[PDB]
Design a protein around this nucleic acid. Structure first.
Ligand SMILES: [K+]
Ligand SMILES: [Mg+2]
Ligand SMILES: [Mg+2]
Ligand SMILES: [Mg+2]
Ligand SMILES: [Mg+2]
Lengths: 139, 94, 201, 50, 173
RNA sequence: AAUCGUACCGCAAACCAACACAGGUUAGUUAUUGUAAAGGCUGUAUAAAACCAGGAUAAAGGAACUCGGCAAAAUAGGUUAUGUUUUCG
């Protein structure tokens, strides 16, 4: 079994394409796998839950192993300690999405700006050729 | 729509459309959709949607009013407009 | 690729304060011949901006900033214009354009200005003596000349120590805390791979 | 201050205050059930479901 | 004609504050250049006709100062390029009246009046506009009058490059 | 290793207020020097009455207003040699 899923339909992830379960509009971390339009029953199930936004460097994370070592011995403090650890894990899923959305926006803006520069260049080149023809025609 | 429907009815009966006159027109009450709308301080009011029936009767050579409307042509657009051929040299003379 | 004005005396600068166009006709003609003839002006000059309007502006600022770093004393705007043109060629046309570039540097603390001392506000307003500008080797967080920056830092350092101990005395943390937010996702990992390929190439 | 918000729903409160287990715990509650059986109400308690 | 009001400039209020009023008119002016024909309400059409004429005047100027003013009005680079290159040459000899307005009745829902705004010289024009330069008969009182009052009257379209510019180029080369 | 929750709304046109109600509703997180990344949202057609509401500007005078400086306006901030009162802070 792999640790992370690698085959995602990126049109679905960004939001241009509908999913395999259209009734769900905002998949949960454990619902992403079965809402993928490329879902297949032959692929082995990953051993951990990650969203499509997670980086490939998360495969070396072992969070529950570290939690046990930091476990307080007082049950009253232990219960609150565990509650804060679960809160940290859930928040990490939505830090990745925010970085994912901000990172893509910068790439899109750069590409859009580059296209704008090229279009103006072609228009100015075309006009210059027309201007030259006018002078040549008039001798 | 009622005027057109009535005229079609007259032709089927064998009347001349060029001599028809509107001789009777009246309305009649239909079935109403009742409702309620809230007001201030817990009071309430009515919210009703009304409906009506329309009846038109056309008869031949009935007494008619003399009203008649003047008719003009609309704006000329396309190849049928020739305002651009006007000669403006005449207005400079006496 | 600087372009000359229709008077063939200077280059046009990329900013909103430039009121002269760029001559672009295939043949050189005096202004008086074609300006009063009645022909369309767009056949002789380009009144618009270049496709690289923003990039050219950034390049010009670097040239001005580098030249100041090579200087050892504050100088006037006129000296800056002459020095840059001599080093690289005719690339700047007016002192007003250089002034606009300097204002951007002053705002972000990439440069500083030395102002004269006047007895009354009215004398300062009516004064016409040119100003002197310098450059910081690295960006700073305080305004003014190096002497003024040191004075401002001393006041800031005292304030920080005053605040930190007052917080401790009133049962607050001496230094504020936050949480570390993870800003590395799949998009960032692909950017790094792209960057290495560009560097290798 | 605006009035009319005397009801603040709570599922745990509703079961404990008016539930069937509560009605069967006292003699007066048992009499209330019999009164509702005599009148023939289809639902006996707010706690009832199929 | 377009009515003149008491506010600065004599423009319409278009039932909007001045800030939203200017944002709306700039967008519509950009679309008029792109498409050359638009259908809207009578008030927005009257304001757009007068605003559109003054935008063409800037394009005909063909100067650095004029382009700066227009660059704050037009919303798209492609539309701004067309204004100074294509439309500038189109209306070289036409003195005003680059836009026409024709009323087109009332709408269906709110029964508001509507009109059509279009450019006055092109392929696809609703009507055929009068020539930019009016021909003058050779034996008319009009010809004599213009000589006495305006010796520099223009009777036929002029070439892009006048003879003085052509002569200078020939002498140079 | 079984069992129950997992759709959708959640400062709201979906919850408490008879309503698509200018009211009420807990916790956890995010960009931003003088600003502010992501994300989210959007108004029948006009105008050159009286009058009403919420703003702006105003010659000369400056509480003459009024039960009453109501409302509005106003260099508002910091450091001071000296003096006064203290329960000495
Ligand atoms: K004009
Ligand atoms: Mg959900
Ligand atoms: Mg109520
Ligand atoms: Mg006054
Ligand atoms: Mg008094």
């Amino acid at each position: 079994r792999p640790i992370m899923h690698k085959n995602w339909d990126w049109e679905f992830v960004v939001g241009a394409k509908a999913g395999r379960k259209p009734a769900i509009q905002r998949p949960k971390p454990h619902q992403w796998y079965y809402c993928n339009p490329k879902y297949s029953a032959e692929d082995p199930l990953p051993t951990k839950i990650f969203p499509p936004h997670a980086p490939p460097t998360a495969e070396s994370l072992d969070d529950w192993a570290k939690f046990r070592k930091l476990c307080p011995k007082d049950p009253v403090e232990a219960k609150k300690f565990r509650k804060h650890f679960v809160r940290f894990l859930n928040q990490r899923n939505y830090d990745w999405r925010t970085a994912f959305e901000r990172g893509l926006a910068k790439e899109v803006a750069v590409a859009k700006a580059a296209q704008r520069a090229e279009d103006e260049t072609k228009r100015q080149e075309a006009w210059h050729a027309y201007r030259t023809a006018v002078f040549e025609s008039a001798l | 729509e009622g005027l057109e429907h009535a005229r079609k009815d007259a032709e089927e009966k064998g009347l001349d459309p060029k001599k028809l006159v509107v001789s009777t027109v009246y309305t009649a009450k239909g079935k109403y959709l009742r409702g309620f709308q809230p007001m201030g301080k817990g009071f309430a009011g009515r919210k009703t949607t009304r409906k009506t029936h329309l009846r038109i009767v056309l008869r031949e050579n009935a007494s008619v009013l003399p009203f008649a409307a003047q008719v003009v042509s609309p704006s000329r657009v396309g190849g049928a407009s020739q305002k651009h051929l006007r000669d403006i040299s005449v207005r400079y003379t006496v | 690729r600087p372009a000359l004005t229709p008077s063939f005396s200077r280059v046009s600068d990329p900013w909103t304060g430039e009121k002269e166009a760029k001559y672009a006709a295939p043949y050189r003609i005096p202004e008086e011949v074609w300006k009063n003839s009645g022909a369309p002006k767009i056949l002789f000059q380009d009144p618009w901006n270049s496709p690289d309007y923003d990039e050219v502006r950034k390049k010009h600022a670097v040239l001005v900033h580098d030249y100041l770093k090579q200087q050892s004393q504050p100088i006037n705007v006129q000296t800056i214009l002459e020095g840059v043109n001599k080093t690289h060629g005719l690339v700047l046309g007016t002192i007003e354009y250089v002034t606009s570039l300097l204002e951007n540097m002053l705002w972000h603390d990439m440069a500083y200005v030395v102002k004269p001392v006047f007895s009354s506000p009215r004398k300062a307003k009516l004064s016409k003596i040119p100003l002197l500008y310098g450059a910081n080797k690295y960006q700073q967080v305080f305004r003014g000349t190096p002497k003024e920056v040191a004075e401002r830092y001393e006041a800031a350092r005292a304030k920080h120590i005053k605040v930190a101990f007052t917080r401790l005395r009133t049962s607050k943390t001496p230094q504020p805390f936050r949480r570390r937010t993870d800003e590395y996702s799949h998009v960032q990992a692909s950017q790094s791979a792209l960057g290495l390929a560009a560097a290798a190439a | 201050m605006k009035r009319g918000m005397t009801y603040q729903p709570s599922r745990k409160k509703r079961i404990n205050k008016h539930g069937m287990e509560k009605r069967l715990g006292t003699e007066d509650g048992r009499l209330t059930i019999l009164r509702r059986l005599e009148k023939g109400r289809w639902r006996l308690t707010v706690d009832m479901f199929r | 004609t377009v009515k003149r009001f008491l506010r600065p400039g004599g423009w319409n209020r278009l039932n909007r504050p001045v800030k939203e009023r200017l944002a709306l008119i700039k967008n519509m002016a950009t679309q008029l250049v792109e498409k050359e024909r638009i259908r809207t309400t009578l008030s927005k059409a009257k304001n757009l006709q007068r605003y559109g004429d003054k935008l063409i005047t800037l394009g005909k100027a063909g100067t650095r100062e004029s382009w700066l003013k227009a660059n704050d009005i037009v919303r798209t680079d492609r539309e701004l390029h067309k204004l100074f290159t294509t439309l500038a040459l189109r209306y070289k000899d036409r003195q005003g009246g680059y836009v026409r307005l024709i009323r087109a009745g009332f709408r269906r829902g709110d029964a508001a009046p509507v009109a059509i705004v279009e450019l006055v010289d092109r392929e696809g024009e609703l009507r055929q506009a009068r020539p930019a330069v009016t021909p003058v008969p050779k034996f008319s009182v009009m010809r004599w009058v213009k000589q006495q009052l305006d010796p520099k009257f223009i009777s036929e379209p002029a070439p892009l490059l006048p003879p003085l510019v052509r002569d200078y180029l020939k002498e140079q080369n």
